[PDB]
């Protein structure tokens, strides 16, 4: 019966390809060929942070745009006060292999995950004055790539088992599981409304998932190699993807096909992290050329290069109020950049 | 000045945290790290117990050095996408089963186990990250091969092989065949050693290899290289 099933699947693929052909009318450049260019963008390091002794892999801003959390391979989770460069907490870890970290919106819990295939939850505000483990979620078969909190009692995770999962923390049991990826997924960015969330995998495919019904809704393709990073537009109707080749892409949601690509001749290496500014005009990316780049989203032209790291830029983040940009590389350093007037 | 009392207290807290981090790094610096790889057929679960989840960690102390052995073979994912986390290790221990040339893989029966080990070694030796990391080769199941080579020649997997069917000639031929796969024979040193029942001697071999690599690293640090 495989023959007929394959033939009808191919027919449906042709049907959707024709539908996408009907959808596409004009490219983004034909519309954004008249707006004013953003001009030169120059930023410098207002403050620098030190204390790690190994490569930094993850970094997440708090909800108040003041407190920071960083994770590195020496087995430490450090919470920084970026205003005056003090350390408020230094949590030791049980496993030294981590690749993600998060900050709960309220500001009471933090989360960690790595090669150990378990998600650890830490509680900050207690009566006795030390951080403690609150939950150790387990059940995934494969390394965890990213974790993001939902409501201080729910969490969503993505792993190398080609699977995403949704958990509640009290009982510590899975509620819904998302499957449909051939290669392993390595990035997810939750929507502001916490109703839908998108994920990009290593098979050059991105997908949309509903958080309650737990089924795939839209499937996006257009890349060749693996997809390494993803981020959500502040509006909630678009998202950007970073690729293992020297390309980035922007997708809209009500139209399944892509809008614009970001590439250049001199750049050959891939993209590690991607983040958006709050106004949605600037697109920040980290590369393997030991520097970060800024793209004008509506025009796909370079407008700024942040140099100053001696190794690969691993993590990149933007505050909620959009006042500073945080960057972390493999040289055991963290940096906070902000332009001057 | 222009700072409050609570600012002073926070500054002292930060200084204490920095001191603790420095001491932790000082303690963690003097430790050797070994990464264990190889085909999952055999030879990996035996050397791990000769010394005495997705990742497994083992600690053992020998002649006043601390050894951390990392075994990751149950991860079952894309090796490229996480093999870079192990850059900076002292050495890679590769275990190769020897009495499997006659043996045939369950999948792709026309394709032999020995060729799978060969391609694994060719992929791991010439990787971009491990350009200076030494590789310690462990050829396993000597007795099984001795009782097996007496019946079948290497032509079942090595048709071009020539020479006598005795044990020593075949063992030397296989060792040379595996050592020939190295391309950058200026920085790497491949140490080969056939295993036996006694576990004390294997630890001595890994100790000597680690000592040589660490002395080379110290010479590189001082610029005398």
């Amino acid at each position, epitope marked *: 019966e495989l023959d007929q099933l394959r033939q009808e699947a191919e027919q449906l693929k042709n049907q959707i390809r024709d539908a996408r052909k009907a959808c596409a009318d004009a490219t983004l450049s034909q519309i954004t060929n008249n707006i004013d260019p953003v001009g030169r963008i120059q930023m410098r390091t207002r403050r620098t942070l030190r204390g790690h002794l190994a490569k930094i892999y993850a970094m997440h801003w708090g909800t108040d745009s003041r407190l920071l959390v960083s994770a590195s391979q020496d087995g430490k989770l450090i919470i920084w006060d970026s205003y005056t460069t003090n350390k408020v907490h230094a949590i030791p870890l049980r496993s030294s292999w981590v690749m993600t970290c998060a900050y709960a919106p309220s500001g009471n819990y933090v989360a960690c995950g790595g090669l150990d295939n378990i998600c650890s939850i830490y509680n900050l505000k207690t*009566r*006795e004055g030390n951080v403690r483990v609150s939950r150790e979620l387990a059940g995934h078969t494969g390394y965890l790539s990213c974790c993001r909190f939902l409501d201080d009692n729910q969490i969503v995770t993505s792993s190398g088992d080609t699977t995403c999962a949704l958990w509640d923390i009290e009982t510590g049991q899975q509620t819904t599981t998302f499957t449909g990826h051939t290669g392993d997924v390595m990035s997810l960015s939750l929507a502001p409304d916490t109703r839908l969330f998108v994920s990009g995998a290593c098979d050059a495919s991105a997908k949309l998932w509903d958080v309650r019904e737990g089924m795939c809704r839209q499937t996006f393709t257009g890349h060749e190699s693996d997809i390494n990073a993803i981020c959500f537009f502040p509006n909630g109707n678009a998202f950007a993807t970073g690729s293992d080749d020297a390309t980035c892409r922007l997708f809209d949601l009500r139209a399944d096909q892509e809008l614009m690509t970001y590439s250049h001749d001199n750049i050959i290496c891939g993209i590690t992290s991607v983040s958006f500014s709050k106004s949605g005009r600037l697109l920040l990316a980290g590369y393997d050329d030991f520097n970060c780049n800024v793209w004008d989203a509506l025009k796909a032209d370079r407008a700024g290069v942040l140099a100053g790291h001696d190794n690969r830029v691993s993590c990149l983040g933007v505050t909620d109020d959009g006042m500073a940009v945080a960057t972390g590389s493999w040289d055991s350093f963290l940096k906070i950049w902000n332009g001057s007037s | 000045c222009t700072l*409050s009392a*609570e600012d002073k207290a926070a500054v002292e807290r930060s200084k*204490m945290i920095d001191r603790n981090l420095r001491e932790d790094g000082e303690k963690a610096a003097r430790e050797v790290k070994l990464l264990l790889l190889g085909a999952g057929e055999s030879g990996k679960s035996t050397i791990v117990k000769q010394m005495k989840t997705g990742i497994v960690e083992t600690h053992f102390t020998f002649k006043d050095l601390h050894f951390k052995m990392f075994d990751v073979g149950g991860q079952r994912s894309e090796r490229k996408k996480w093999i870079h986390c192990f850059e900076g290790v002292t050495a890679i221990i590769f275990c190769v089963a020897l009495s499997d040339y006659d043996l045939v893989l369950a999948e792709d029966e026309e394709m032999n186990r020995m060729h799978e080990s060969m391609k694994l070694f060719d992929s791991i030796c010439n990787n971009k990250w491990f350009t200076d990391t030494s590789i310690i080769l462990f050829l396993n199941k000597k007795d099984l091969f001795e009782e097996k080579i007496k019946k079948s020649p290497l032509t079942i997997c090595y048709p071009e092989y020539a020479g006598s069917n005795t044990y020593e000639e075949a063992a030397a031929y296989i060792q040379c065949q595996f050592e020939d796969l190295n391309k950058r024979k200026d920085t790497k040193e491949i140490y080969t050693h056939f295993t036996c029942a006694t576990d004390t001697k294997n630890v001595q071999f890994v100790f000597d290899a680690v000592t040589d690599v660490i002395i080379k690293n110290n010479l590189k640090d001082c610029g005398l290289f």
Partner: single-chain antibody
Amino acid sequence: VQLVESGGGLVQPGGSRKLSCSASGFAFSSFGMHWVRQAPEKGLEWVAYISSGSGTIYYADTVKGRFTISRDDPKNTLFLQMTSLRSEDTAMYYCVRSIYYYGSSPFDFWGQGTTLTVSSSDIVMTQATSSVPVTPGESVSISCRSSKSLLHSNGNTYLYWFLQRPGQSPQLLIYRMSNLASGVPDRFSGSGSGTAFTLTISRLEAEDVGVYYCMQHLEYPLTFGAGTKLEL
């Protein structure tokens, strides 16, 4: 969390006394320690201060020289040594914890205290309300007054509120003039700007009986107000 102390009683003049604070139920090395004396029929006055790691040691002018304060972190104990006593040192003492970092709440816990009876510039806080009779269900406001401005360029105002019931230890209600602690109900509120400082209670329960205190924590001489007495 508990804090029990020992030592004291009747002492002849010219002697010496060892006072001990023994802590159990929480981490200790991350906390700084304070001592506070209580006048026989008046408000409290600050005495000493030791910080975490035994780096900074602070005293009061009236007790300098003959007072010493030390700690033993591994055994979780705190010591005060007093010499050359006199009729002034007739008070019942309290042992207080405080932790300092971004977002922390200093002066969260208080102890029971022990009695010491003996035989025969600084910013000033004034509360001139003395005593006021109120009935349950009637909203109440309490005023505290300073001399110098209590606002620093870091955007923080250092005023603390305390409430003392008859037969109990003080409890913290408001820190940094505007924030509630843990265990306090919602009906307590606080506000004010510059010098005049206001505390408001909307609903009154039977348990809301006693003396209210305002405290400053800007300059290290820590002075208490006269206090507000509330009764039915």
